[PDB]
Design a protein around this ligand. Structure first.
Ligand code: NA
Ligand code: NA
Ligand code: NA
Length: 129
């Protein structure tokens, strides 16, 4: 499923991401825009053989099991395909674990490079929240 911007803002807010670990909602919407273009089905291979999955591009090197990242971890204890569903629960719950691990949103390269340091509240402008 490809979410609209305000559609995703509402879903992320209902799932408890607004102000999670101090990151306002616009941070999460911005991250999803630039990680996946709001597309739950997005997948992208990393050069180390791992793959990023879903609307927040969560990495099989550490966070989920995709059956083809030998020796990697599965910290969210899920198949990576769970991160591709139209239901964003698994992606949100795994993102909450990632952002709590000590590095915050710096885990998301697109957030670091395209959201951090910008007016991220713009990403929820015009939305009914
Ligand atoms: Na992989
Ligand atoms: Na893994
Ligand atoms: Na990531």
């Amino acid at each position: 499923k490809v979410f609209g911007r305000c559609e995703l803002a509402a879903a992320m807010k209902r799932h408890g991401l607004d102000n999670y670990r101090g990151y306002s909602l616009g941070n999460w919407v911005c991250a999803a825009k630039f990680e996946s273009n709001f597309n739950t089905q997005a997948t992208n291979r990393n050069t180390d053989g791992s793959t990023d999955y879903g609307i927040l591009q969560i990495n099989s090197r550490w966070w989920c099991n995709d059956g083809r990242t030998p020796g990697s971890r599965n910290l969210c204890n899920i198949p990576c395909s769970a991160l591709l569903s139209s239901d964003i629960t698994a992606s949100v719950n795994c993102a909450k674990k990632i952002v709590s691990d000590g590095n915050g949103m710096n885990a998301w390269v697109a957030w670091r490079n395209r959201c951090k340091g910008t007016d991220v509240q713009a990403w929820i402008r015009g939305c009914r929240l």
